[PDB]
Amino acid sequence: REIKGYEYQLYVYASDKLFRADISEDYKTRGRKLLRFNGPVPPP
């Protein structure tokens, strides 16, 4: 098919705390948007 774009699901440490962040990214432009940011989460 297309690819409209991508979605990245990350584990990111910020201020020594672990967060889960989801980021969308347009295929052509690489335009990014923060979709979700939640934490602290237990380590993977």
Partner: protein
């Protein structure tokens, strides 16, 4: 394909930096200082 595990190199680290910078604008978690992105990192491909 669709869902894949990606590495945690500079590109992924910068995605993390972007996430923290965006979150800092929102303020839900106060002022955060980006530390690093760790494994695993997943990448989903969106179609249509």
């Amino acid at each position: 394909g669709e869902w894949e595990i990606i590495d945690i190199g500079p590109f992924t680290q910068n995605l993390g930096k972007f996430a923290v910078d965006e979150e800092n604008k929102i303020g839900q978690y106060g002022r955060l200082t980006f530390n690093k992105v760790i494994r695993p990192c997943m990448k989903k491909t969106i179609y249509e």
